[PDB]
Amino acid sequence: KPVTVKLVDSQATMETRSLFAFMQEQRRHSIMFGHQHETTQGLTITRTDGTQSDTFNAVGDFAAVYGWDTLSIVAPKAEGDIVAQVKKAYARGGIITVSSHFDNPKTDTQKGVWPVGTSWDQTPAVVDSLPGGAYNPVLNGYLDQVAEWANNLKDEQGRLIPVIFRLYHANTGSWFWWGDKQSTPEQYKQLFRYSVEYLRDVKGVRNFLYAYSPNNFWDVTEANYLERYPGDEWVDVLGFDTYGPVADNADWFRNVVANAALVARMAEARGKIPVISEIGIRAPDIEAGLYDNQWYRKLISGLKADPDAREIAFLLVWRNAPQGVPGQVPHYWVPANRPENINNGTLEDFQAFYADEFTAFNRDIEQVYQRPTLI
């Protein structure tokens, strides 16, 4: 039965429209599991060619949603090319999302002492990157590369692969150059809209859904979410990002459910897809060797009990760094099939999350891209 869909890109491909329609239906029957660098980074994988994952080694299926970043698209591509791995995910019927950790357009020639020139260079660069600003050509260069990548991202039949493109995330904090100390709300909205327009209208991208993803709010109100929201004409997917404590985390879990309930209600009202774009125990706690061996069970229990929060399409957790990060210390979110996670109880926790009938992994999602739609 054909369903009516209103996307940011009114000329989006049939498969991109189908992805939107798929999640609109699926989200009231399950929550899909997502994982950043699902088949490109893992503690237990022996090849990074797109055929293995820590998730698969833990539970016997891949994540449903595969996350990557513009760090694998825009020069200098610090995280490496991902075209092959995206194609393998798509061939398996998976869903692809890409976040944007864009370099700082005002300071990217100055790289040398981290974090200078990167997303984490807090030098405000929104005003100077919009048209009229001195560094607008630098931002355009990044968007040119994103567009070239998208416009050539084709399956084995030569049809474009849809991607959920999550732009300028975590914008209600100030650790990125597009954040809340770096821009007024209007300036941030202009950056988001300019960038979507550039991709869609100037460069002709037809295979994106656009996602907005602020941090979780502690005062959970529609008005707060709306302050930097780019608008219904500019966003397909309403998300948020949240990282919490490894211990004494009941209040934080209640806050996860509240923010999810808010985006779910807003999304129904506005014809959007609600998601949790990024969720995890905070990296510093994981890096200290700490664990919560009930974390995944608490997550799915809390979300599915709430009549609104359960309606999110997916939740995504961050990357499983194969050798950790420089203290080397651990930096991973999917419990791996290895002695450490067997002994501390985290692998059992994740297997229980997988077993839960409301979670959806890659074999649980079918005919994502062949659903008929009208505009």
Ligand X SMILES: *[C@H]1O[C@H](CO)[C@@H](O[C@@H]2O[C@H](CO)[C@@H](O[C@@H]3O[C@H](CO)[C@@H](O)[C@H](O)[C@@H]3O)[C@H](O)[C@@H]2O)[C@H](O)[C@@H]1F
Ligand Y SMILES: O=[N+]([O-])c1cccc([N+](=O)[O-])c1
Residue 69 contact among Na ion, ligand X, ligand Y, none, beta carbon within 5 to 8 Å by kind? ligand X
Q: How far is the CB of 97 from Na ion (least distance, A)?
A: 16
**281 — phi, psi (to 5°)?**
-60, 140
Binding site for ligand X (CB under 6 A): 69, 71, 78-79, 99, 101, 241, 243, 278, 283, 318-319, 325
Residue 102 contacts which entry, Zn ion, ligand X, ligand Y, none (Cβ below 5-8 A, type-dependent): none
Scanning the chain, the segments in alpha helix (DSSP H) are 14-26, 54-59, 83-91, 136-151, 185-197, 222-226, 250-270, 283-287, 295-305, 339-343, 346-355
Q: Which is nearer to ligand Y, 51 or 224 (CB)?
A: 224
For residue 283, the partner it binds in Zn ion, ligand X, Na ion, none, with Cβ less than 5 to 8 A by kind, is ligand X
Question: In this chain, which stretch among 109-117, 164-172, 255-263, 345-353 interacts with Zn ion, using CB under 5 A?
Answer: 164-172
Residue keyed to tokens 């949790």? 276
Smallest distance, Å, CB 34 to ligand X?
12
- Taking CA atoms, 152 is separated from 66, 85, 148, 204, 205, in Å, by 19, 14, 6, 12, 10
**Partner from ligand Y, Na ion, Zn ion, none contacting 27, C-beta within 5 to 8 A by type:** Na ion
Site for ligand Y in 201-260 (CB under 6 A): 243
Q: Which stretch binds Zn ion (CB under 5 A): 186-194, 210-218, 227-235, 301-309?
A: 210-218
3-state secondary structure 98-128: EECCCCCCCCHHHCCCCCCCCCCCCCCCCCC
Q: Choose between 175 and 354: whose C-beta lies nearer to ligand Y.
A: 175
Task: Return the closest-CA partner of residue 209 out of 1, 35, 373.
Answer: 373
CB 163 within 8 A of CB 237: no
Site string for Zn ion, 122-161 (x = CB under 5 A): ----------------------------------------
The residue type found at 182 is Q
Question: Which position's Cβ is nearest ligand X?
Answer: 78
How far is CA 338 from its chain centroid?
A: 27
Q: Which residues bind ligand Y (CB under 6 A)?
A: 175, 243
